[model samples]
Target chain A: NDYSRQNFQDLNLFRGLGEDPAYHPPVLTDRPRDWPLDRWAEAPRDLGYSDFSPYQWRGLRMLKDPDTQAVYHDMLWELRPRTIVELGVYNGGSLAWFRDLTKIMGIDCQVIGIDRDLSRCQIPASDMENITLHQGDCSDLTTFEHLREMAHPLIFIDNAHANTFNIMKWAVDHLLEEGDYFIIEDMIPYWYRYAPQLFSEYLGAFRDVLSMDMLYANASSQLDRGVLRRVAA
Target chain B: NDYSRQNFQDLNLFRGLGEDPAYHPPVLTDRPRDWPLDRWAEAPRDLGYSDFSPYQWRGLRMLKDPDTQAVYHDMLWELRPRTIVELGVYNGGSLAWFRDLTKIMGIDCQVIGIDRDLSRCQIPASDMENITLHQGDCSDLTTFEHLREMAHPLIFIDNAHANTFNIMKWAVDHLLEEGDYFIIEDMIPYWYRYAPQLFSEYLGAFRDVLSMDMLYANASSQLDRGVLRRVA
Candidate 1:
């Protein structure tokens, strides 16, 4: 994940959507008409620089949107969660990143990376002391039961793009505790574009079901990886 | 250019890179083996949310590498060049950016963005006060001759990748003054990857001919747009 942090930090060559005022960033809704080709960020984006693609961070390849990743990185610095439960671990980069951040912060932390398929991933390196890589469907009841041990954890849902509606439902129904913050990456302009109905329904359902507040909106317009924090009930 | 400077200054989410040691930035050599996939850097990248393509900056749709752009932006703040002659003005983004930097510094500057084609460009809005967009060929002798009016200027060679060796040679031969600086974008790792001989040859030629020095190197390995400064 340090590689993830480093790689994600590289995307910060511009600036991240932040807590400061006077920063009117383009959200998913702000994209111009001739998008995917003609947008208002930088040019030559088709350079195939997958700043948004799944890339190796630290030692493992992970799927992450840079904008979302940046926002998450900032929040991590602020929140300093003792435990982080990441659903849909594509590669162990993010897991390792969490381990590194805690070390940098001088906090003893535990990070669990859950993926349904273990065959695809290399087992966590022996050096990664903080992460507990688990192979189980996050949507299952047993998974929530397994994660119950960690209190007030930060949940990162990278696999949300696959079944956002269901996993989000599971998170709202099962995971979120008081003071817990969770991030649903690759939402906004994407969900609006890809799954209009499901995206709409998921937003509506999540809000109605729990205290979902925006920690950071997708300001990049490329991928508004919204960071939503679950408020204390 | 006022808009360019204002817009660019607005994008200065972080302090400009200086002789400041704290800003220990990673360079071209720092890229990992999984490059184009991973790289390194500190936190607080001016996330002015300029991602997702063409966000408005001083009224130009420029195709700029953010990392290179940041480095250039920092130098612009420090150098405060009175004139910036841009070659191969792609979409007017960099042109406007140069304009913007000067305005922010309150320096009356001249930014000439030259490209063969203008009709294809959306054309920078009229409000940009410092830019003089020109339709001409940078490779031609007359172009440099025409630019002779502007004394001791910073020449930004975006078109270098297209005819770098010739222009850089011309720059060393005719353009550069004692303290002028010029940037050769998308060189090194890029040219090194695409055409190794030319890249190597260009480096060899430039060093032997002129006092060229590395002002900055891209940490983002994807495009090592090396900025070269001129010295005696």
Candidate 2:
């Protein structure tokens, strides 16, 4: 797979991952993950370069860090989860991104968002077929159980910042399904303030049930992919 | 001239700007007037995509802001600045970028970087070119005199964290060229801690002297030819 011709074929000609067969990045066979993977971080964003869309990633205010981008790439490309169930719709930009990814990948996936912010998620003129927004909280396990009868679900927990652990624990009890990934976004700041112990231990327990939790390695280093491996197996 | 496709030729896909009439961005007679129509931003850089080289911009943290990029594209492509003088070269990432721009444009433009810590500009040893680093306090007339020699300098004052007024006054006094653009980045933070009345008043002086200091329009949106306007 790494033949020079085939590897360097998609040459950007500008600043690209130059042809260097000797480059053997630290392999990630285990779990958890590092952030700002300096070498692998250079892995040309395959998604951005492709499709070459016209819309610009609005500057400044919407500062998407490399860690966020990495998580996005892993979700959009590597996981390929067919059904995305998200709590706390917020601005809903990432869902829109998933819609485009499904369109490009030729996947029949649906992004079903569960948020109490009904007004924020309402879309009257949207032709983006891959998304469905519902004003309901997954905290209602009985309602989620009914949803489970309708479609298999992959969950993303990005609810109220203060109630992060509460939301995630609820997600573990009801929303998190087998063979599906559960992502808890914005955990670093969450753990830093209230529960520093969770930073060290509680997050590792996510793998005990769902089998993976993304961990950022400090401010500027590749992620630390594992503590979830023990519970994953 | 849009219909002159049959008569037109191009420079290399990247580096073909010269007397070659087929590739000239603006025709010779299109000069604004017989008045010494000045433009110091050289070809290739003024004409092509920025050079994204390894030695340049290596290991530098780049903030993700489409709007900033838009403004950058406008500045680089339209303004075509040949030289950039940055006061306070913390880690030198921005300097590395300017160096890349000049290299891509195929110009031997100078990047005079002054950092209190001479070692502030840190590029991988593998990729270093066009950036000459100097250690000094760039607020004095001595620094201004040295920087004044540079043609069409894009002066960026970033040492305001230490001394706001001194740096602002120094940058203002040093802006010798008529069209030279002076930028006081991160003014938002300072506009809160200290009164920018002096800075704003100085910028007002700049506008009074040059007739134009800050372009309010979306410079990124400015387009005349196929070339992307304003590159940061």
Candidate 3:
């Protein structure tokens, strides 16, 4: 029962958001889903359903919350990045969402999802327009070498938290150009909480090369103080 | 490697907040502790320090963030509960804070902390005024039976996230009187994320007994949607 010795990914971390692409609405057993208006005061105020369970893009389960989606939507409109590279694929709902959003917005964006396991991706082959899937591990730098030829005005998102600072350094040294964005999702606060000293020093090391984008950094809880932009060389 | 089969607590969850009560400020290796004023724009905009590292109450490392502190301050003023039972002790900084705050507010409150290990508590023997520490496991219901005689208008806070719903049920059935509060801190979101179906069903089962106090529930991220009040 030595939790520290365990090497497997804690699947509990992704609870509520199941690996299945098809969305299943949470059913309440103890209480009725719809309460009578007359007894509204007695009804529970807490969200009966899971927070991230209902968020889907065309039947595919999208893990992004509303606040996160809104922030990305605004960012997509502003940056209009030619390439949108996501480090984790999951159900691939987000990749499709990004592709569709950019296409509708008249931004010729190519969405790329990289993960060690791409088998969970639910996107149909017919819907794969500008979306590309790659099998790779975040811990290995070789997996990112193929992404060097991606177009500039690119938006690189690190949803996979493994070897994050190393990947950030790689992106800074090789991939990111001026005005391009590099975003770390969900793990910054945890990293800062767990490894405060290292987190600060690692982020600070990129101070000259990257600046925290004030506009979108605090825009959502998911992007909290993590939206960095490549400074002009 | 089978994570679900493991029974021990994940110590990584308690990361920067060490078990030892001694406050050691994080030393920087790569950058100077203080930056030059001339190169202000070049400095990192990120919190160069840990979010909860500097939050100390009289040199004791209080784990609560500013927003959580503010919410608890307001809750104390509003509720003025005679008994405050915290499930996890850690460094005992929060227990001390609660005792001192209640004393300053002229409230006759007894602060108690329950944990399997009380060895990490840093509060000096002389500083133990109305605060009491009890050694107990959160998973064991019998440990909480000792608190049957605790004063009414109680506040039960589940900082230890083990066997939480059972404890909540116990509190509702035995401990919490009308208007009493049962708060689950920091772990509700995680629990909901990890065990959504059970979390929802368990919470909903208490719909008849407790109601979410919206005023303080959303005030702090730590207490997010977890402040439950016993209904009349």
Candidate number achieving the greatest lDDT relative to the actual structure? 3
lDDT of 2 at B218: 17
- Model 1 chain A: worst 10 consecutive residues (lDDT sum): A32-41
Candidate 3 local distance difference test against the native: 0.81
All candidates: CA RMSD (Å):
19.0, 25.3, 11.0
TM-score of chain B of each: 0.66, 0.55, 0.87
Give one digit per residue, the lDDT tens place, for model 3 in A1-233: 11122222223445545535567666676789778999989998777765556787888888888898999999999889999999988889999999999999999888999999888888999999999999999768888999699886999998877777677777878888999999988878776676554566667777778899998899898899899898889
Return whichever of 1 and 3 wins on TM-score: 3
TM-score of 1: 0.43
Question: lDDT tens string, model 3, B1-232?
Answer: 1211223233244554653466666556567878999998898766655455577888788888889999999999998989999999889999999999999999999998999998888898889999988899876889988865888678999888777777777777778899999998887787667656556666777778889999999999889998999897
Task: In model 1, state the lDDT of residue B73.
Answer: 47
The per-candidate count of clashes, in order, stands at 23, 32, 0
Tell me the TM-score of each prediction against the true structure.
0.43, 0.36, 0.55
Per-residue lDDT tens digits for candidate 2, residues A92-190, read: 545654555455444567887666665543232445476877766545544345454324435353533445555566666765565455444444443
Question: Which 10-residue window in model 2 chain A sums to the lowest lDDT?
Answer: A54-63
lDDT ranking of the models: 3, 1, 2
Report the lDDT of model 2 for residue B9: 62
